[PDB]
Design a protein around this ligand. Sequence first.
Ligand SMILES: Nc1ncnc2c1ncn2[C@@H]1O[C@H](COP(=O)(O)OP(=O)(O)OP(O)(O)=S)[C@@H](O)[C@H]1O
Ligand SMILES: Nc1ncnc2c1ncn2[C@@H]1O[C@H](COP(=O)(O)OP(=O)(O)OP(O)(O)=S)[C@@H](O)[C@H]1O
Lengths: 741, 254, 67, 137
Amino acid sequence: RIIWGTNVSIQECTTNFRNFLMSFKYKFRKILDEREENTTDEELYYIKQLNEMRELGTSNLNLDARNLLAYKQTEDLYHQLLNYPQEVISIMDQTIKDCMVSLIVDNNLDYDLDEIETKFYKVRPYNVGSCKGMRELNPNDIDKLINLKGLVLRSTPVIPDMKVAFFKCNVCDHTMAVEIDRGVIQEPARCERIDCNEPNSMSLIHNRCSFADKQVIKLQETPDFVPDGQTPHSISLCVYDELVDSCRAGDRIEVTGTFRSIPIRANSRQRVLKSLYKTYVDVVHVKKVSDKRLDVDTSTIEQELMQNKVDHNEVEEVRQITDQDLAKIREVAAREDLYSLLARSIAPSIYELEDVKKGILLQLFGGTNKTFTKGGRYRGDINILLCGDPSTSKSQILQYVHKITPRGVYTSGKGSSAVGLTAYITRDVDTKQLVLESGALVLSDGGVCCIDEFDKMSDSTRSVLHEVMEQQTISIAKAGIITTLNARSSILASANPIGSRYNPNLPVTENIDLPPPLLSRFDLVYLVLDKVDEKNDRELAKHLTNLYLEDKPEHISQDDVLPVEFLTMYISYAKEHIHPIITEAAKTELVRAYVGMRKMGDDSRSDEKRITATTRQLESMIRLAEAHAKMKLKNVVELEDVQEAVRLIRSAIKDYATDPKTGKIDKSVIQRKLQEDLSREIMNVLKDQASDSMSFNELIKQINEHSQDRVESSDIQEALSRLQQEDKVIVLGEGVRRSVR
Amino acid sequence: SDEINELKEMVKDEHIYDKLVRSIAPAVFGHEAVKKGILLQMLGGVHKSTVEGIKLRGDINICVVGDPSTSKSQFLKYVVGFAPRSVYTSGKASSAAGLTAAVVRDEEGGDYTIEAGALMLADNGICCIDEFDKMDISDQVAIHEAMEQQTISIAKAGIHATLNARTSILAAANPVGGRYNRKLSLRGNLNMTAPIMSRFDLFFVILDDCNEKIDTELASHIVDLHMKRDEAIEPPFSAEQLRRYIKYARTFKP
Amino acid sequence: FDILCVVRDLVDEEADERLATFVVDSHVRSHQLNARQRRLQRQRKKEEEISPIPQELLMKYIHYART
Amino acid sequence: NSRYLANSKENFMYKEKMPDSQANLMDRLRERERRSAALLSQRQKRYQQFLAMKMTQVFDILFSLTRGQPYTETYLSSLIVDSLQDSNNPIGTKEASEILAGLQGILPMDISVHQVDGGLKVYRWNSLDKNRFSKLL
Ligand SMILES: Nc1ncnc2c1ncn2[C@@H]1O[C@H](COP(=O)(O)OP(=O)(O)OP(O)(O)=S)[C@@H](O)[C@H]1O
Ligand SMILES: Nc1ncnc2c1ncn2[C@@H]1O[C@H](COP(=O)(O)OP(=O)(O)OP(O)(O)=S)[C@@H](O)[C@H]1O
């Protein structure tokens, strides 16, 4: 039968769809995906889900449209879905109930064949192809299946909706109940079964009448593409009876639903309407939070859909994976200069100041969510201030990162207030509820933020940080409402030392202005100091003039290939397929590293001027080393992977013991003595080692490992080079090292 | 009669008072001073009125003040999740009016009425707070009556009323200079007036200093925490049976 | 104003001891038809531990006076 | 006296000074570990006791109000806690999970619980009589 309004005939669709629901297997999906193969040898996926639901009575069947797509002879339906949801959904539910019936007439007992057939069945097709957010939504697709992302602002309280009337038992004494099946409600003039009152005033008992949940959910899409000038848009939503309350305020949900368009009234007295319809989205399915908190539930059966959703994590969350892409990934991971390479691969236009890039990269992979049943909220990510002499790429690095990440929210300082930093709540008097608004920090829930002129920020502001940075929550308490909105977000602030540059006659923690609490709050502080080198200076000048040479300049730095686009998907794979477990050996070297950090910081006059190593130093070391191990796709933290973490934390501090003001205008006498004693000992060994030849490595294990920590061993290279000039020994091939006759 | 056996156990044991105090902060490391201060908080006094003359307070207000990284916010964001009917407010974000009571208009009768606020909806429970120092005096003031007189009194927009707020309070403000000079004294070091310094019937200026036989233990502890697998953190008494044991002990009025 | 009650807290080795005894005894005394008799009269015995006039007398007194 | 669980004497002082025994205390301690086996297990049975009494009401907690058939585990638990268990006699979440497991086990006739991916969904209520099996403490 052809449809007068869609010309999409039913019989063929239902017929193909039936054996579609019986021919379905995991493999179709795998072939399109191209991922490595079993799924218990590809059992029938749909009968799996169908049996499970029949036994659980969910009557809701989640479905990824790409699955139905990846099967032969169904793409017709796969597109008609995107084009005729209003009826393909109907025929889908019909087929669902009918295959339930065939299954139960094959499967002896379930619902006695009737309780099943009585209750309806709804389908939940999600992930039909992510549309291009709001500003793309065309009035040409008024009735199509859109996918939208973005957090929700406000949820109207549960609103009932008439479904079946229950009309007043008249003096005739036989109440009558009737549904509506449209926006119309008909009350029969005559009274009840007997026409005791043919003329009658039938009334309605609006308490026993059934109802249906209709929740209106405003939505503010993610600022993935919002160019400038306009605040990210908003698309009101409606939800019908099963996904209701699956989305509280503040959540970061994703939705797949049909677009709609309805006129409005102006006077509301006369029946005349207005052109320029208003629009919303009748949702169909809601990807729950796109998060992994899993503290407690929110709603009814819907959580069963959430459990059916979370298990397929790999392809659905990567949104793209191929072992040619994954092979490229593992290959890159194999490359040795990785930590260097990817560093520059973040901001290729940025010059030699690599350690900044390193810290930034480590921020991108930030930490792992260790969720405790007791305690909890251990700020899974990190936070990086950076400061230094004006005009030193800081602000541009921030721009660069904010562009890199898929969730960044740029923001300035001193042009912003505490409300801007942490959403502000409003008791809406319309429905007397809690709405949240414009959290700059909340927009960045997940993924980094950026903040400039951090010093120039007001003291009235720069106080919400004192909370959000260490608990990732904001506890607002004003006249109407008290609440705590959690905003997990890795801040990344620029700065400017007081005045307009250093004063290497001034203490460092005074040269930075911020108070020590908020300062130690920052996981990692950089001091990008400007030098008068004249050795890098001309290199930098060339590094600018070259980009000015071309018209459309690319790869401003050395011409080494680096994957400007690949690295983003690389990151969004790493942060989600690997969770570093801190092995035992790491624990030791981490503890000793902390102890050494703190004992060094010890002093009597370190109290007022220095930055003291405190427990957050250990938090930094651990949350940062596990991020390093997440990089390189390492599944478990090694021991030689916290060492560079220590190095990075020491980027700021290396050069002062009792008083700050590093100074350190970079061959020392104590270095002379070091080389000299090493020469003594190594000559004594090689003259005691009668087999006069041994490798540099063997010699190192002979001496440099007998006791406490190994030495550079390139200072050993200079030692043996001296012993070549002096000719006390002879390398005699790289494999060994002999002495002189 | 069954649960009587469970209490009977958890109360007839000899060292409960110790078994309890080292089992209030399973994650936190040590601080056997403060943990005691909290365990006593959830167990109020008697608040029994005097001769018909007057009524006196029967509640305790511990007020930690500590150097950086002393795990002082952990105690709060724990208590407020374990003490019944409690509330956590950052303070500086909030305002004094919000903290005690709000006056607001309603369209039902076109009249002014009361908003409970943190203090009134925190009745008979701990109402923890953060960063007093950051809370400008404009809001520090609005608490005093919920400290000693135990009740708030408000005369605004025509409505005069008085609501009793039997609420334990807390605090976690940081010293003036973030960290406080061991050099300087304590007088010109806390930056808070005399009264609100007195009304706190505890005081814990927590320090933070260097050591080896301490910092090693602390680091091992934090690591074991971040090593989920090594959640050997199980204290004697769970964070649940402690609740029922309290809900019993709340009734003795010795 | 006319009267200015100037109060002051001063450390004393002894006066505070007596005051303390007083306050402790205060927190000590704080905490059918014949039970109600035995209760009212015991409350009045506590009203007499502070030996001068009982309260209800004094509030009726102030009412009488100001009238 | 009536089980007013006070201890006004045990806190008197270090009265425990009369017994001036020899190393005989090791003797006592030699048996201590023995009872440690029973004591522990005894405490264990206490929950086999304690949880018991709790479930005596639970088959009238979910029953008498909740006739939604597909109920899961997390939702039902978070209902049990914060139910009347916010009164004099509180309880913990995972303890509620234990209560559910025990109810199912002591009545597998109706209560059928089978887990899918996370959280054990629970059966479709059919309202038996219970204490007849509650006597099986
Ligand atoms: N090493 C460098 N690599 C790349 N660009 C550089 C470098 N040094 C300076 N620049 C350029 O010099 C300018 C400095 O910009 P920024 O340093 O980001 O601004 P800014 O440093 O934040 O200014 P202030 O005073 O610190 S707020 C930009 O045009 C940079 O591209
Ligand atoms: N004694 C401790 N044992 C274990 N971990 C600790 C300890 N002290 C602090 N930490 C950890 O270090 C972090 C900082 O703790 P706090 O200093 O309490 O933070 P805070 O409460 O924001 O302090 P302020 O004064 O408000 S900046 C916490 O997330 C703890 O996990």
